Amino acid sequence: ASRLYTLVLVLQPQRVLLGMKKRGFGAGRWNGFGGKVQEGETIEDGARRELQEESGLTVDALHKVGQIVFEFVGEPELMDVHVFCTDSIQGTPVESDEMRPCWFQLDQIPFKDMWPDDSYWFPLLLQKKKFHGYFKFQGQDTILDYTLREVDTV
Numbered sequence: 001a002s003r004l005y006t007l008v009l010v011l012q013p014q015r016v017l018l019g020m021k022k023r024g025f026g027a028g029r030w031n032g033f034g035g036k037v038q039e040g041e042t043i044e045d046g047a048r049r050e051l052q053e054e055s056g057l058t059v060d061a062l063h064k065v066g067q068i069v070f071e072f073v074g075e076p077e078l079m080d081v082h083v084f085c086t087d088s089i090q091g092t093p094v095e096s097d098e099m100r101p102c103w104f105q106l107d108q109i110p111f112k113d114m115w116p117d118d119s120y121w122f123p124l125l126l127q128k129k130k131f132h133g134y135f136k137f138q139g140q141d142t143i144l145d146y147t148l149r150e151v152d153t154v
């Protein structure tokens, strides 16, 4: 059994929008916008909701670019994260109680202050290539195992 999550990356030709997580799961790291998919909504609806609630932004089209499964040692449910990117956004991003957004040049992504798995799969995102990944975590900082491949259907 897995639980569904979303991750939205606003990736423009020279910059990517990241948010500093202010509370909750993953606080203190930069990440895309997302969270749990709820009952009653599709995965992409959950992604648009979490984007609007964490950044104020709405989007015209969301594209599937990745899926990553996470196992945490001792936790029964795997996290099944559906990763989406978009180029065009509607509005300018604003802080929420959850996320502090900020633009980053593609040359200057703060991997040291992101989730560790990001160092592995973010490059395939910046290459506009579709990927499936799996990462096994012990705690929040230590990757024990991982697999990562490119796919044609995400």
Ligand SMILES: CNc1cc(N2CCCCC2)nc(N)n1
Pocket (backbone or CB within 6 Å): 005, 006, 007, 031, 032, 033, 034, 035, 036, 070, 079, 081, 115, 116, 117, 118
């Ligand atoms: C565990 N490693 C993770 C987790 C994660 N989120 C995405 C939003 C919803 C929670 C999970 N994002 C990234 N980049 N790495």
